Amino acid sequence: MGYYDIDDVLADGTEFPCKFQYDIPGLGYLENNPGRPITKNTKLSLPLWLARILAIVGPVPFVELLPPDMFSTKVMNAIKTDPVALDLHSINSHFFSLAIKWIMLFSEKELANVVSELLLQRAQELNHHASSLSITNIATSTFLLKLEEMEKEIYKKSHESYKDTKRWMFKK
Amino acid sequence: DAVFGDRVRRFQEFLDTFTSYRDSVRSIQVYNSNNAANYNDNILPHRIIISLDDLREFDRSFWSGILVEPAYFIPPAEKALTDLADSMDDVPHPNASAVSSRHPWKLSFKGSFGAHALSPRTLTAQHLNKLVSVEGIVTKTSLVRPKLIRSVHYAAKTGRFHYRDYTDATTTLTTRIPTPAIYPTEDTEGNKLTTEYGYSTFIDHQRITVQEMPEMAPAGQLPRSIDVILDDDLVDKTKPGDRVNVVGVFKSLGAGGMNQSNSNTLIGFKTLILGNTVYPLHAARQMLTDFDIRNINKLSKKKDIFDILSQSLAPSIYGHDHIKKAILLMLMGGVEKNLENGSHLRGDINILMVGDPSTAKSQLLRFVLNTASLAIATTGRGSSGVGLTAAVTTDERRLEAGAMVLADRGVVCIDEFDKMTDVDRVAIHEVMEQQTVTIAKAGIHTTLNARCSVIAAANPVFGQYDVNRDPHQNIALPDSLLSRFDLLFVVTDDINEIRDRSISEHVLRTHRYLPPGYLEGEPVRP
Amino acid sequence: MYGDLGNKLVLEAKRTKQLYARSNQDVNLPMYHEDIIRNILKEVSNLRKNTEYLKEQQQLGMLDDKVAKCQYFVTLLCMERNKRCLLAYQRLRTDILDSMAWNNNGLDTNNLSHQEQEYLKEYCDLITDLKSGDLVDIDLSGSLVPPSDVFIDVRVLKDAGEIQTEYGVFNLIKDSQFFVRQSDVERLIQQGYLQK
Amino acid sequence: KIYPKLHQMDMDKVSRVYADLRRESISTPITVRHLESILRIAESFAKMRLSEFVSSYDLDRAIKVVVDSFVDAQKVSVRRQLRRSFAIYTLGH
Amino acid sequence: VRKDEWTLEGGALVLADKGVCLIDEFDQDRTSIHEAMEQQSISISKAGIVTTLQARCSIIAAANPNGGRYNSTLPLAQNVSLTEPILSR
Amino acid sequence: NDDDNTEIIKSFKNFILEFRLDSQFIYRDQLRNNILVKNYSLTVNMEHLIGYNEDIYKKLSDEPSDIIPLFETAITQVAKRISILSRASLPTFQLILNSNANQIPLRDLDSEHVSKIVRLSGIIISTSVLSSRATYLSIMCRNCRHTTSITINNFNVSLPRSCLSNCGPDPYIIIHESSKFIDQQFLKLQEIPELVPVGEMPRNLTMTCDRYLTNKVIPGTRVTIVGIYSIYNSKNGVAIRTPYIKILGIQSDVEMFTEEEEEEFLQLSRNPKLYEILTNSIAPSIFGNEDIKKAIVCLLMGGSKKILPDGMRLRGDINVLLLGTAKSQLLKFVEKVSPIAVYTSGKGEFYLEGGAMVLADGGVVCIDEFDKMRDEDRVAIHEAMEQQTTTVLNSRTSVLAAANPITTILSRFDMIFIVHNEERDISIANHVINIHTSEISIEKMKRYITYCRLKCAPRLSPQAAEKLSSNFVTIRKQLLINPITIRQLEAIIRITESLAKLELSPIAQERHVDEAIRLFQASTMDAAS
Amino acid sequence: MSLPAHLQQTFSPEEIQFIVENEPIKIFPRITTRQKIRHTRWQLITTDDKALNNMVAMRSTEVVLWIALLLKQQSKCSIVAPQWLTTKELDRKIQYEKTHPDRFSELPWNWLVLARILFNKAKDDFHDPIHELRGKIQDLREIRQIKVLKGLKYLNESHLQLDNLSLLEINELRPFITEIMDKLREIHTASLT
DNA sequence: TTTTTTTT
Ligand SMILES: Nc1ncnc2c1ncn2[C@@H]1O[C@H](COP(=O)(O)OP(=O)(O)O)[C@@H](O)[C@H]1O
Ligand SMILES: [Mg+2]
Numbered sequence A: 001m002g003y004y005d006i007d008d009v010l011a012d013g014t015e016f017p018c019k020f021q022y023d024i025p026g027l028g029y030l031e032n033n034p035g036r037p038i039t040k041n042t043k044l045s046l047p048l049w050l051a052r053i054l055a056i057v058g059p060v061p062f063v064e065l066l067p068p069d070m071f072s073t074k075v076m077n078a079i080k081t082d083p084v085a086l087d088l089h090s091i092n093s094h095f096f097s098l099a100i101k102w103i104m105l106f107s108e109k110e111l112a113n114v115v116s117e118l119l120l121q122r123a124q125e126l127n128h129h130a131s132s133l134s135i136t137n138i139a140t141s142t143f144l145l146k147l148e149e150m151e152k153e154i155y156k157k158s159h160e161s162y163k164d165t166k167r168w169m170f171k172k
Numbered sequence B: 001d002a003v004f005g006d007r008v009r010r011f012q013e014f015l016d017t018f019t020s021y022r023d024s025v026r027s028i029q030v031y032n033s034n035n036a037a038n039y040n041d042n043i044l045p046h047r048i049i050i051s052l053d054d055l056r057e058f059d060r061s062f063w064s065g066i067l068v069e070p071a072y073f074i075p076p077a078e079k080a081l082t083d084l085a086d087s088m089d090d091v092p093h094p095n096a097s098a099v100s101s102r103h104p105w106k107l108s109f110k111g112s113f114g115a116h117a118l119s120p121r122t123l124t125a126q127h128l129n130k131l132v133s134v135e136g137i138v139t140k141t142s143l144v145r146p147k148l149i150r151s152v153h154y155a156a157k158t159g160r161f162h163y164r165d166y167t168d169a170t171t172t173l174t175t176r177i178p179t180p181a182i183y184p185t186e187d188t189e190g191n192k193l194t195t196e197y198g199y200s201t202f203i204d205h206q207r208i209t210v211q212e213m214p215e216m217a218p219a220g221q222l223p224r225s226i227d228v229i230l231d232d233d234l235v236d237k238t239k240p241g242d243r244v245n246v247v248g249v250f251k252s253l254g255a256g257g258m259n260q261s262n263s264n265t266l267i268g269f270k271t272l273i274l275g276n277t278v279y280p281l282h283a284a285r286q287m288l289t290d291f292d293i294r295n296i297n298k299l300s301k302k303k304d305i306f307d308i309l310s311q312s313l314a315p316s317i318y319g320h321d322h323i324k325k326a327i328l329l330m331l332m333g334g335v336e337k338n339l340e341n342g343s344h345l346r347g348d349i350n351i352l353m354v355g356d357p358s359t360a361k362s363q364l365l366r367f368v369l370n371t372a373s374l375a376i377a378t379t380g381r382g383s384s385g386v387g388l389t390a391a392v393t394t395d396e397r398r399l400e401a402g403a404m405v406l407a408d409r410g411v412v413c414i415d416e417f418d419k420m421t422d423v424d425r426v427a428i429h430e431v432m433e434q435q436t437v438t439i440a441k442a443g444i445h446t447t448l449n450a451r452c453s454v455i456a457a458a459n460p461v462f463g464q465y466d467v468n469r470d471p472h473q474n475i476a477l478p479d480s481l482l483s484r485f486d487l488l489f490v491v492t493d494d495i496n497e498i499r500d501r502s503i504s505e506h507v508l509r510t511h512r513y514l515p516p517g518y519l520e521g522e523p524v525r526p
Numbered sequence C: 001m002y003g004d005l006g007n008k009l010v011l012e013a014k015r016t017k018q019l020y021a022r023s024n025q026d027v028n029l030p031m032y033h034e035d036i037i038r039n040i041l042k043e044v045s046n047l048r049k050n051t052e053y054l055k056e057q058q059q060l061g062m063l064d065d066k067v068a069k070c071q072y073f074v075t076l077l078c079m080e081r082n083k084r085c086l087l088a089y090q091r092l093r094t095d096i097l098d099s100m101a102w103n104n105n106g107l108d109t110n111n112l113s114h115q116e117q118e119y120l121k122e123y124c125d126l127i128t129d130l131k132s133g134d135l136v137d138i139d140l141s142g143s144l145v146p147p148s149d150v151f152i153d154v155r156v157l158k159d160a161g162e163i164q165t166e167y168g169v170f171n172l173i174k175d176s177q178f179f180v181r182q183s184d185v186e187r188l189i190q191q192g193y194l195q196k
Numbered sequence D: 001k002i003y004p005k006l007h008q009m010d011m012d013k014v015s016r017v018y019a020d021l022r023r024e025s026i027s028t029p030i031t032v033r034h035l036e037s038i039l040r041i042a043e044s045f046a047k048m049r050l051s052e053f054v055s056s057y058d059l060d061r062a063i064k065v066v067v068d069s070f071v072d073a074q075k076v077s078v079r080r081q082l083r084r085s086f087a088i089y090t091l092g093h
Numbered sequence E: 001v002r003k004d005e006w007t008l009e010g011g012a013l014v015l016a017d018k019g020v021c022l023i024d025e026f027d028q029d030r031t032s033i034h035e036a037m038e039q040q041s042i043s044i045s046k047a048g049i050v051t052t053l054q055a056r057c058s059i060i061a062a063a064n065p066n067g068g069r070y071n072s073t074l075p076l077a078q079n080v081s082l083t084e085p086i087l088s089r
Numbered sequence F: 001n002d003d004d005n006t007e008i009i010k011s012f013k014n015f016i017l018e019f020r021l022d023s024q025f026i027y028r029d030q031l032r033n034n035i036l037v038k039n040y041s042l043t044v045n046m047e048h049l050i051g052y053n054e055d056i057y058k059k060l061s062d063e064p065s066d067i068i069p070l071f072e073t074a075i076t077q078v079a080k081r082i083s084i085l086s087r088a089s090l091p092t093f094q095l096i097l098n099s100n101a102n103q104i105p106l107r108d109l110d111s112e113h114v115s116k117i118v119r120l121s122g123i124i125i126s127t128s129v130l131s132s133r134a135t136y137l138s139i140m141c142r143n144c145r146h147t148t149s150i151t152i153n154n155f156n157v158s159l160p161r162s163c164l165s166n167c168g169p170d171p172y173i174i175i176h177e178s179s180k181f182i183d184q185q186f187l188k189l190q191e192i193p194e195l196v197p198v199g200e201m202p203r204n205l206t207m208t209c210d211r212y213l214t215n216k217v218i219p220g221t222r223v224t225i226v227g228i229y230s231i232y233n234s235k236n237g238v239a240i241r242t243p244y245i246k247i248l249g250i251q252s253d254v255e256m257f258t259e260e261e262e263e264e265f266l267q268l269s270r271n272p273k274l275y276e277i278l279t280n281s282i283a284p285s286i287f288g289n290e291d292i293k294k295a296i297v298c299l300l301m302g303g304s305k306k307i308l309p310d311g312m313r314l315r316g317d318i319n320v321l322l323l324g325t326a327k328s329q330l331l332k333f334v335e336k337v338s339p340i341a342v343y344t345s346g347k348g349e350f351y352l353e354g355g356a357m358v359l360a361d362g363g364v365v366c367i368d369e370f371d372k373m374r375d376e377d378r379v380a381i382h383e384a385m386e387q388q389t390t391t392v393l394n395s396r397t398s399v400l401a402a403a404n405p406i407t408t409i410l411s412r413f414d415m416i417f418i419v420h421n422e423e424r425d426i427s428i429a430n431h432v433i434n435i436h437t438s439e440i441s442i443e444k445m446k447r448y449i450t451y452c453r454l455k456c457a458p459r460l461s462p463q464a465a466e467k468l469s470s471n472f473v474t475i476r477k478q479l480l481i482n483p484i485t486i487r488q489l490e491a492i493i494r495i496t497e498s499l500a501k502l503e504l505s506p507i508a509q510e511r512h513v514d515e516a517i518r519l520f521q522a523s524t525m526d527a528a529s
Numbered sequence G: 001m002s003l004p005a006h007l008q009q010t011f012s013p014e015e016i017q018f019i020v021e022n023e024p025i026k027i028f029p030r031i032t033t034r035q036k037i038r039h040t041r042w043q044l045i046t047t048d049d050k051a052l053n054n055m056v057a058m059r060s061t062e063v064v065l066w067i068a069l070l071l072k073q074q075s076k077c078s079i080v081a082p083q084w085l086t087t088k089e090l091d092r093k094i095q096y097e098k099t100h101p102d103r104f105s106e107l108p109w110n111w112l113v114l115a116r117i118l119f120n121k122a123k124d125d126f127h128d129p130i131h132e133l134r135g136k137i138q139d140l141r142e143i144r145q146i147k148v149l150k151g152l153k154y155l156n157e158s159h160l161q162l163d164n165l166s167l168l169e170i171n172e173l174r175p176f177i178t179e180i181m182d183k184l185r186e187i188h189t190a191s192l193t
Numbered sequence H: 001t002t003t004t005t006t007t008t
């Protein structure tokens, strides 16, 4: 990821459920109440960019990352059952990149395997759609709608490549 | 055949993989056995909900076969389940009927259907012969009804029993030669038979119409609906107007015009969903966990917890703390005694406030409605005396159930009750007082439970309650009805600059509320 | 939270990036969100004041080892997050400005911040410095499309009068067509006078 | 066969006449529907004499007829005042 | 709408196609005229089939003022019961 | 015979695999793409087929019922050849046609057109629900148990009566499980209103579509259709057979914001007098009525609806009351420009629902005269608007009240309003003359308003909060020394939200409060009348 | 920025064209530049000049493709069809493809682009019926695309082996394949501690 | 449609 990567910044903006392991004062503003002091075991969802570092530092870290819904057992079950049908966009805009960030934060091999599967399976149909140039179908429309931001970007790129190929090839 | 037995043993292996299924089966078997033991005077049905994901993981091939070709996988699966149960089951001293019962074990699935998940409108012929699930609201629930499946017959003069089973499209996923549906009258040898009812086995057949969700219903389109053949335990698991998701095998039937007798042959085959399991969708009944019960117990330890709970109610609304407490008690209701002689002792509370326009009394009733477990919302003009209590309907002529009949053990609320027609008010009198409704119109004498709690709202006779004038002057309702009714809360507006500013700030902060996820300019969706 | 304003700013940056990319033709960049930047800067200044007061309290030693540790670290992290957001937005605008410079300037000032306008002017100066001197023989600002066609027929889209050429003169007369080598009139085509 | 053609030059006088009628309605209620009725009945006048071009006389008869149909309103209230106001618009020529 | 089978039939107002619709004795008829006068067409959703029938026909009306001898006092509209929209159209 | 059918199939295969224009096998590519999206169906232009060879087109016209299935089989074979590697299944493909030739009016259709590929158009009046059609069947013989199957087409068969390896009169039976079926709809079409002869009932006719042609349109939609004039022996006259049409193809006569739209809306916001431009833009023909224009803007913009954690919701739909045809034109314009609206001045297969007002949701609901409107009594509107509400009205729409002729419903409605320039009257007369013989487009306001209400959600600023509190308490105290209650305060707050939403400010401003109270007073002064 | 985004990580079809024209090709000159032992000269730089100044009418020779096209735009040159561009050759390649579904045929790395160019500006030279050649090329394209999809089915982090895939197809599929490989590698690496 | 208690 690039320090000036828009998508990276936006993904880092996304917050995750977390819980404190210390009762720090003068931090209630995190709870939108600067007057109040943070308490130990305080279940708070925090920005990824922040939550990450807070998890790193602390030994007992100052905060714990709770298992987010996007990586809930239900989510993996749905992924394994049917990757394509899954509306990754609904569960999150930047699900993939954030999953990679999670795996980097915690080396969760099974999660990586599931993500790799999902990626390949959905990429197959993404390529099918992008190649099916119209000489906006509803099927590819819904596939796009379920498409994630990164998936959307790659689809746009591939579709443009195919469009240029056709344009230069069929036409002078 | 060979594939069928192979699938049977494969599902046996699957069951072995997750003892939880076998553990639940044993719990069912032991539970029913102990129920039968010492019956001073319900039995768990032989059915299991196997997690679909478990199958997908243990053997993706079998899982896919089930989802796509249920007619060829579910049968052997349930066969294996029944065999495992029986072998594992003790089945001690089974009754003669139990011997002939052959009561098998059914299967069911939970969640993770993916594409197979659908909706009545989104259903498609392609899905035919594939296990699928859909969601909708139940309508036109057909009545329960028995259905012959076996015709146990005793061969008199020979001392023997010759049973015959019966086939139907609904009964069996796979297509089979239809049974003649004729009771064996005489033995194939020639000895006359006798229909040994009871020993012969029957099943409960039900038909229901689940329609697409009106919320999902596209504009200018009548919501499509599909029928589900509920059977056995599945029968009577719902009723009309029940938003529910069901799982079944979407199946085709009939000749669809293909029959020679058909002349036009411009018709299509009939289709149905042999529901295997039904999942009711309240979105009701609240749920509790031991941790929550302990929290409640500790909370009761708090002294003024009554006050805390009352304040928790209508937090948006301000100033009616006493009315909030009254609503709290009402929701708690009280004890309704009923003497052995038969006398009925109302234990329910009724709450009503005469208030100025925009007093939020209507808003307060709205809050009580939504928070209530089971409530009935209506209004003076919008309500009808028969519509509120009951209306004799031509249907044999039946009796339509009014609001009071609905939510009989729940609560009810009325807006602008003062505006209610006095005839319907005297209609209410009996409902509320006797806690029951009786109708003898159209030559139909009837009596109905009517113990639902009632919380009306009204504006004074003069719009603004004149404290100078008598409450009787300010109240159009007869004192009998008032005395009939429980708790009169006269709420009056006042220009108390301090109080006016208090509520102004309250409402301003209310409008300033922020969804934690959302921000400024982001439209939604002590 | 402090990061909310940066999130809004980066959302605007993403929107403008998609604006430029989706539109095949070059699009003038949107207005600089001076208000949002000023608000974020005010937040940063407030965080600076908070850090200074936190150091003061550390000299007071009010549970500094843990409380001041955490508070200082979180303040620094929020400030860094805001820094990154502002940097990303500004860099995206800078890159689009560079694209504009290369595309046309080598060949909407109000929307640009005065710093942005100065930077764009400097970038144009730099480009003209590059194409001037060594490597001048090739026109870096020239089209990146390969010159497949030696000769192209062209119809003057907009009349502009006669124009000069190394060895000729072209009379730009509305609805008049010319058959001339592509290279000679490529600049005019880029200027929109010439069609096809 | 007959499809009257409205006389724009005359329709200017029609405009100012309708404005006068509006003023008097404010004095004591005309509508654009009245203008359209005047136009339609002028066309009908043209048709009765097989005129595919509406003439000023068609418009004069239309004005008189529509003004009368307005007069039928409010007899004892204003009939006399309306009569005095429109004696030239409806009967004057 | 009646079985032919299942079929609809038009109405007298519809039957009037550029033809004067003589009528008098001025309910449902009133709203039918309303829709007719506003636009010379007849909308209908009978049997859940929304559609319109362009009458495009002239109309002629007659009646007794307020069901009695005309009254010079009170305006013509007051001398009748027709809604002002009806009168204007 | 079968050889000739194979020859026709080969000819169509050659047409598909060879028909090329310029340098593109348009049909080959189209088939490949349609397969790529799993849309197993091809569309063919008749002109193209004629160009390839007139003979095939003519043969098709002669016997469409049989030729078409052969063409679909050819399509299937070509699809298999191009999408699945040979020596290394697909369903029958739907064939779609487009003649684009001279039409035939619905009424004109008669015996002459029987079995002929017809080309026509109309407006679809109704749409049935899809039904099963057995493309393929699995068939068991009842006694000897001989397996077999049938492949049926949706053109021009019945279960065989003979054993085919006495066994019985019809020993065969259907195995629904192995059998395969498709979807089939039924649509009814009426002649174009124009096409209707003088003072004649509009003729009507019924069709059937299947495969991908299913669910392609909705009732009340003008469309042009191509199909074979067909007749079926309805079970419902001697030698009289019911005529229908098999839909070969459909074309729609009538047939979200991009970067440009959002940019335009942003620039509109950049404008300082944008609100003033709007007010100038609503019903320009209705000169004056400035407060009316302002209230129209507010109502069109709605308000920041909020749901409290306790659950109780804050309404966002403002409701305005107005008090001849001037207001009628105003409401007509409002509904025209409104993204969604319901205009009605009070005049207003076994299924029943709520009244017309119930069906209205979102958008707006306008009524020219409440003083005239009394259907279902006021109380229905009282509930439907105050509460936004088996018999529950789950609708949420702003109500634009208006009544030229002269309480509780006034307490319900948020704003209240009423309503000589002779020169504008002259101008209007001249406009009528011409037709008989800032500025912003209605569509532009529609898009802008919907975009804003979709994206914005203003919030009262704290300073605005104190201003509102002080203003309300001061008004009430002034009333005391001389009624404004929480209803009016909520109305003012929602007006302020509407103003901020116009400015797209995520937060409000005391400017919005000032303007909102100014407007609300206008309702107050009218309320005085 | 000095390079448009669409050019950032690939070549547009036009660049593919250009690189193709950089190649030589058989041609039959209709002019005789070769001056007899008994004058304007080319004198090129990026390519040979010896041949150009020795053109002899109806004498086969090689020239860089773009020069050949320049002359062909005039009547003064004729472009000799490459041998692989022959009905026999195309049929043989098709049969090989059907014989070896796993593997691609050994077509010239620039077969698609070269064929398109010749078809557009060399229809006359082609001895075989041009329509048949276009059709066979299209069929080869279809088969190769199908095999491309089959190979995509096995996309993996480790590596890929396109083998005989043509340059045009490679440029067509560059972005998708590269991006997918990048994401997969990112995921797997993140899994690594 | 017409006649018809009965309820709404
Ligand atoms: N004391 C109060 N606290 C909070 N809100 C109030 C209060 N009094 C009035 N309101 C507001 O006034 C609005 C209108 O009240 P409403 O339910 O119409 O009163 P009523 O039923 O007396 O007409 C409600 O939305 C409510 O929020
Ligand atoms: Mg109320």
Ligand SMILES: [Zn+2]
Pocket: F141, F142, F143, F144, F145, F146, F163, F164, F165, F167, F168, F171
């Ligand atoms: Zn047989």
